[PDB]
Design a binder for this molecule. Structure first.
Ligand SMILES: CCCCCCCCCCCC(=O)OP(=O)(O)OC[C@H]1O[C@@H](n2cnc3c(N)ncnc32)[C@H](O)[C@@H]1O
Length: 555
């Protein structure tokens, strides 16, 4: 009997789901069931774990760092935290090895920011953990085995209340400035309620499919918590397994008649880029009811490519649902209409760059940007476009996207200023640029990423697009930003070995951009993969901008 995130507390939520027959299903890279976890069972393992955790003399409010793998182990640990009233803090594994020194610097800052009293990890990362917590004595380091091996602290489990902290979301900080989003039970529930009942609009019989990491915002709140608060089943792939065989995602959907799934723009592009007939041989995608896109500025153009690619296996493009969100609001902020397909608004590009206004292309329009409709505000939540000064602007005026309502965070963990402002105004400036049209939000990009030169602004992605036209360059391979000396740099990480082609493409690209944009850009060909992402899994444009700046000061 379905309930739409109805509950006060995540523990309440799960208590109800342990009464269903649904659960999670972990699949290997060949879509083979590798491990299963029923909610009924999850509740038990969570209660027991909650008591084990307490035997460690950990007090309510205390933080427990989890190494967020896509695993039955991690899920249990996470709810074990909720039930034990401890604050869960999901951390990302190492981006590999060789980046494993990058990781430790990151990890130590995470620890300085929230002082976890314990950290549960899988064996694989156990060495690394110990080698990195080298100088945090006050930290218990538990393998999942040692953790499962603990004694039930003989105590009566206290039920959590709405205003308790449920978990901290760290994707929001840099390696230099770690920021922790505080999410209370009330807040994560408000959003879960919004998503299930108002945004996505789930139905009985729906079934989710995710390949997203639990360490990112989307994967976790959208795909661990939402199937739990909705008593709906879900199937996971590992994020790395998808990266290597994209089509295994569509496979999984078609295999179990999957219904709902959401990925970033590139998740969709990766697929259509690397599909082959052998792959289309299994696929039937009529069951796919809602295909969501968000996390980064959506490319209408791509999504069209993808839909065109999979019409033949029954992908309905009307199932597309562009949506918008951030961690600072738990997850979701807006969703495109039900059964909408991608809806776009075209604008005179020059009017946007020069006058910061979204107007419709006229007879004299010479350039056009396309923005994707990301929906209207959710029930009880507000979305407002404000300018520099903090004053609300009209429709079609681009400015700072500001949000408010129950989902809003409490502030950054430890940050008094952040909590004070939110407590005072009830509004948060997301640091994203956009505008409204007939109440729908159009997200154009991050204020941080915007290329600001004399008297006009350019959207870095409009320039990077020109680079992605080349066969060798893909989306994300190219980063654009403006140096502090007002010189525009375009960095491109690529596998082009031929020295003749390098020179050829650099010269062609320079020209093509000075034609299109009236700006001369410095093409920087880098090695792959030489530019990596931020903690939220997007292109670190701003980070690359300073790396370059700091570098250039060595002159
Ligand atoms: C079953 C239910 C599933 C529910 C699906 C949930 C839908 C939520 C969508 C993703 C949540 C998220 O990505 O978190 P994060 O803090 O890491 O990134 C935060 C930042 O991302 C950028 N940004 C996200 N969207 C964008 C978009 N459309 N256009 C342009 N910029 C977008 C922003 O500048 C933003 O402030």
């Amino acid at each position: 009997p379905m309930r739409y995130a109805d509950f006060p507390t995540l523990v309440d939520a799960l208590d109800y789901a342990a009464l269903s027959s649904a659960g999670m299903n972990f699949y290997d890279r060949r879509c083979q069931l590798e491990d299963q976890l029923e909610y009924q069972t999850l509740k038990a393992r969570a209660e027991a774990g909650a008591k084990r955790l307490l035997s460690l003399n950990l007090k309510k409010g205390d933080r427990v760092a989890l190494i967020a793998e896509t695993s039955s182990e991690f899920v249990e640990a996470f709810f074990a935290c909720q039930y034990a009233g401890l604050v869960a803090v999901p951390l990302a594994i190492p981006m590999g090895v060789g980046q494993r020194d990058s990781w430790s610097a990151k990890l130590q800052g995470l620890l300085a920011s929230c002082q976890p009293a314990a950290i549960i990890t899988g064996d694989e990362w156990l060495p690394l953990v110990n080698a990195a917590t080298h100088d945090n004595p006050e930290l218990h380091v538990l393998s999942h085995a040692w953790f499962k091996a603990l004694p039930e602290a003989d105590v009566a489990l206290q039920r959590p209340v709405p205003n308790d902290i449920a978990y901290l979301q760290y994707t929001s900080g840099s390696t230099r400035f770690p920021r922790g989003v505080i999410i209370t039970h009330r807040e994560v529930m408000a959003n879960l309620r919004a998503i299930s009942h108002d945004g996505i609009k789930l139905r009985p019989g729906d079934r989710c499919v995710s390949w997203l990491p639990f360490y990112h915002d989307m994967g976790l709140v959208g795909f661990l918590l939402t199937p739990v608060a909705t008593q709906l089943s879900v199937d996971y792939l590992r994020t790395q397994d998808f990266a290597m065989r994209p089509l295994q995602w569509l496979k999984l959907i078609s295999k179990n008649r999957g219904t709902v799934s959401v990925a970033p723009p590139f998740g969709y592009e990766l697929c259509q880029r690397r599909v082959n007939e052998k792959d289309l041989a299994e696929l039937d995608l009529s069951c796919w009811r809602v295909a969501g896109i968000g996390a980064e500025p959506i490319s209408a153009e791509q999504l069209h490519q993808f839909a065109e690619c999979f019409r033949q296996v029954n992908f309905d493009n009307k199932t597309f649902m562009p949506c918008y969100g951030l961690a600072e609001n738990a997850l979701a902020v807006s969703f495109s209409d039900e059964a909408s397909g991608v809806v776009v608004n075209e604008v005179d590009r020059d009017i946007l760059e020069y006058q910061g206004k979204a107007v419709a292309p006229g007879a004299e329009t010479r350039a056009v940007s396309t923005f994707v409709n990301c929906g209207k505000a959710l029930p009880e939540h507000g979305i407002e476009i404000r300018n520099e000064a903090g004053m609300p602007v009209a429709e079609r005026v681009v400015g700072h996207i500001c949000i408010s309502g129950p989902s809003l965070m409490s502030g950054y963990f430890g940050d008094q200023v952040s909590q004070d402002e939110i407590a005072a105004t009830g509004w948060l400036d997301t640091g994203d640029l956009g505008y409204l049209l007939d109440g729908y939000l159009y997200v154009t990009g991050r204020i941080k990423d915007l290329i600001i030169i004399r008297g006009r602004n350019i959207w870095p992605q409009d320039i990077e697009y020109i680079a992605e036209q080349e066969p060798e360059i893909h989306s994300g391979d190219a980063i654009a930003f403006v140096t502090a000396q007002e010189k525009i740099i375009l960095q491109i990480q690529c596998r082009i070995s031929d020295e003749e082609r390098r020179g050829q493409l650099i010269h062609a690209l320079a020209a093509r951009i000075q034609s299109e944009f009236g700006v001369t850009a410095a093409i920087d060909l880098l090695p792959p993969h030489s530019i990596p992402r931020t903690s939220s899994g997007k292109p670190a444009r701003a980070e690359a901008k300073k790396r370059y700046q700091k570098a250039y000061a060595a002159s």
